[PDB]
Amino acid sequence: RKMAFPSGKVEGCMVQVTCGTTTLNGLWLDDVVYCPRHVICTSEDMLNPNYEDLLIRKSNHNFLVQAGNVQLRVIGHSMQNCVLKLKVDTANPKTPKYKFVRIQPGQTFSVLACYNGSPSGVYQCAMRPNFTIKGSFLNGSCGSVGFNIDYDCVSFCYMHHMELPTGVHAGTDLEGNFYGPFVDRQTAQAAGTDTTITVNVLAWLYAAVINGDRWFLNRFTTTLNDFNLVAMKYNYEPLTQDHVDILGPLSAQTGIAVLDMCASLKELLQNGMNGRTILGSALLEDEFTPFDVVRQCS
Amino acid sequence: SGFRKMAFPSGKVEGCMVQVTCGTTTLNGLWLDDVVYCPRHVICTSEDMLNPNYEDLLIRKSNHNFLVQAGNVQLRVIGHSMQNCVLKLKVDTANPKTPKYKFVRIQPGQTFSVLACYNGSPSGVYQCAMRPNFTIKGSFLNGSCGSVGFNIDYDCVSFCYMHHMELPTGVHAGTDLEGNFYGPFVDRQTAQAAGTDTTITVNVLAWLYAAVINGDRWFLNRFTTTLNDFNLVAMKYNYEPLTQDHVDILGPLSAQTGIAVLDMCASLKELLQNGMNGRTILGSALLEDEFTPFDVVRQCSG
Numbered sequence: 001r002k003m004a005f006p007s008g009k010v011e012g013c014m015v016q017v018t019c020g021t022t023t024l025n026g027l028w029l030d031d032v033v034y035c036p037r038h039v040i041c042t043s044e045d046m047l048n049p050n051y052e053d054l055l056i057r058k059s060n061h062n063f064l065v066q067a068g069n070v071q072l073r074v075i076g077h078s079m080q081n082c083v084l085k086l087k088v089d090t091a092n093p094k095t096p097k098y099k100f101v102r103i104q105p106g107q108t109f110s111v112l113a114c115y116n117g118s119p120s121g122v123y124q125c126a127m128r129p130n131f132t133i134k135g136s137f138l139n140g141s142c143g144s145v146g147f148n149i150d151y152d153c154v155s156f157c158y159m160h161h162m163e164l165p166t167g168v169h170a171g172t173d174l175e176g177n178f179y180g181p182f183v184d185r186q187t188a189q190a191a192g193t194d195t196t197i198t199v200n201v202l203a204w205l206y207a208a209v210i211n212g213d214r215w216f217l218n219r220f221t222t223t224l225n226d227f228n229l230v231a232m233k234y235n236y237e238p239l240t241q242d243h244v245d246i247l248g249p250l251s252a253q254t255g256i257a258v259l260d261m262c263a264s265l266k267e268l269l270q271n272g273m274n275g276r277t278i279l280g281s282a283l284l285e286d287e288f289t290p291f292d293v294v295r296q297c298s
Numbered sequence: 299s300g301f302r303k304m305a306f307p308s309g310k311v312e313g314c315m316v317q318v319t320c321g322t323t324t325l326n327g328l329w330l331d332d333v334v335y336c337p338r339h340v341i342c343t344s345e346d347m348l349n350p351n352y353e354d355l356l357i358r359k360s361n362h363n364f365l366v367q368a369g370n371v372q373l374r375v376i377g378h379s380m381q382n383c384v385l386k387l388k389v390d391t392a393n394p395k396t397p398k399y400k401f402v403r404i405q406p407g408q409t410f411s412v413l414a415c416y417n418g419s420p421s422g423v424y425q426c427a428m429r430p431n432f433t434i435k436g437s438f439l440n441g442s443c444g445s446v447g448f449n450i451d452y453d454c455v456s457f458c459y460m461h462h463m464e465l466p467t468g469v470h471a472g473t474d475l476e477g478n479f480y481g482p483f484v485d486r487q488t489a490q491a492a493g494t495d496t497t498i499t500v501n502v503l504a505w506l507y508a509a510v511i512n513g514d515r516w517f518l519n520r521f522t523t524t525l526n527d528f529n530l531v532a533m534k535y536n537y538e539p540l541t542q543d544h545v546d547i548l549g550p551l552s553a554q555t556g557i558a559v560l561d562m563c564a565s566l567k568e569l570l571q572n573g574m575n576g577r578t579i580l581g582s583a584l585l586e587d588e589f590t591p592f593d594v595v596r597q598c599s600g
């Protein structure tokens with residue numbers, strides 16, 4: 001089961017930010033609201049926006065920030081890469097313990113999808129190898145955030161900025177740097193060739209074994225390098241020795257050596273699944289990490 | 299592709315989760331106003347689990363036997379009663395985080411969010427579909443009982459599920475918040491069989507409407523059917539028969555696409571009888587049955 005983190009600590013931070021006729025979401029931590037800087041653009045700016053030039057011309061009173069029924073007074077603003085930081089006169093009392101992190105491709109995070117500053121859904125996503133995410137984001141979702149929770153600390157890793165023509169999504173970390181080669185201008189942008197997160201597929205196969213599903217296993221083994229040759233042929237990410245180590249606990253628990261599971265996955269890539277399904281799925285799932293699988297077995 | 303299982307934000311429910319302990323048995327409870335709701339089998343020992351005498355077990359209990367805690371803070375119990383398979387513990391403090399709420403009993407095919415909890419602490423949130431045999435495919439471990447399933451409409455939380463047990467096949471069973479089990483199950487430590495599962499027809503039809511909304515409509519044909527005729531055919535392919543309520547909840551998607559429900563039923567009947575023929579719908583040769591008409595509207599139209 002693809003499981004998201006409980007979203008309560010993040011819901012208490014979502015606000016609505018408006019400039020002119022553009023409305024999106026902001027993240028209110030302490031006395032600062034973070035949001036995508038493209039809220040300051042008009043239609044006639046969106047194609048090549050000189051954001052520093054646009055921002056020096058804005059006044060504090062041009063930003064309308066609403067937390068529920070309350071308006072928050074903006075008392076200063078600055079820009080950090082693609083994120084606007086609005087200083088407000090009030091501290092958010094619901095601010096959790098938090099940090100800002102930049103996640104690696106193949107890592108997963110929960111998305112709290114918001115519209116008009118109101119949370120609407122929560123779901124799990126992975127940072128794709130090509131630095132897109134396969135999200136569910138509609139108009140007005142910008143400023144929705146992705147996060148992980150460790151103990152009582154919320155680690156914010158993603159803020160939503162745009163959709164690509166293929167229907168996948170792109171955004172930044174909370175320092176405002178995009179993941180991937182994307183730019184916050186209103187243009188049709190393609191991503192690099194995506195690849196499949198091999199260590200995650202292996203984690204998921206182990207999960208299927210842990211739940212009594214093992215039709216895809218076989219008697220064979222493979223070397224790491226020979227596996228990686230076939231993996232790259234099928235546009236799967238290479239498996240590193242650190243990946244093999246990370247899979248150690250699932251390997252121990254199931255009694256199935258990592259390179260044995262690699263030989264199972266090699267068979268599935270070359271032979272297909274031929275009708276069969278694994279954990280309900282007709283496709284190999286690659287948005288469960290080893291940690292995710294273990295968190296949900298313990 | 300295009301669609302994913304999306305849960306409701308869990309914060310309003312997180313603010314109601316507590317733990318309820320009898321002896322060394324700890325499970326989760328739901329604290330709303332000055333009442334805590336939880337599975338009655340918290341009052342059981344292992345010697346009593348094969349066929350507990352819940353009525354006698356409850357007479358032996360007093361208020362001071364129940365440890366209710368929000369985090370590490372004890373909530374004093376001032377009354378107790380049993381309603382079907384749920385224990386209702388009156389407490390001396392009204393939960394200040396109580397949302398607007400209602401208790402609803404859902405129908406098979408309906409989806410809901412589960413906030414999986416252990417020792418009163420949330421671990422994760424995910425969407426579940428109530429199968430036609432009244433089981434769900436949850437991710438529940440020991441200590442998860444009392445976790446709840448819910449939907450959120452406006453600012454109102456509709457609680458529909460409380461978790462009680464696992465079946466030999468690995469699926470899960472539970473009650474509504476009035477303590478009435480979904481399906482033929484009972485809260486005893488015994489092996490119980492779920493009915494053979496079937497495919498959720500109304501959700502498959504929702505999925506076909508979703509495909510049409512997205513411009514994927516090769517499968518629409520020029521014919522219609524009666525509901526009875528479709529139901530008789532559908533049963534032969536292990537699809538659930540449609541109810542009048544199912545026809546009604548497809549109303550909004552029917553109006554959005556202009557395709558009458560019974561016309562879509564005729565298109566589905568042809569897929570069942572003739573198969574996909576190596577074709578796909580929304581990228582898959584498999585028909586999805588875990589997205590309700592409401593789920594589809596939420597993700598197509600927001």
Ligand SMILES: *[C@H](O)[C@H](C[C@@H]1CCNC1=O)NC(=O)[C@H](CC(C)C)NC(=O)OCC1CCC(F)(F)CC1
Nearest residue numbers: 038137138139140141142161162163184185187188
């Ligand atoms: C912010 O709410 C919004 C979110 C997207 C709208 C629909 N789904 C989304 O995720 N973001 C934007 O509108 C950006 C703003 C730019 C200044 C970055 N633009 C955008 O996402 O454009 C969408 C594509 C659609 C296809 C296309 F070819 F026309 C090019 C742009």
Ligand SMILES: *[C@H](O)[C@H](C[C@@H]1CCNC1=O)NC(=O)[C@H](CC(C)C)NC(=O)OCC1CCC(F)(F)CC1
Nearest residue numbers: 339438439440441442443463464466485486488489
């Ligand atoms: C409450 O936390 C717990 C939840 C289950 C533990 C593991 N996964 C779960 O969903 N519920 C129980 O332990 C119930 C208690 C009874 C009084 C209802 N018992 C139970 O779920 O038993 C599981 C079955 C498994 C198949 C079997 F044949 F072995 C018979 C017992």
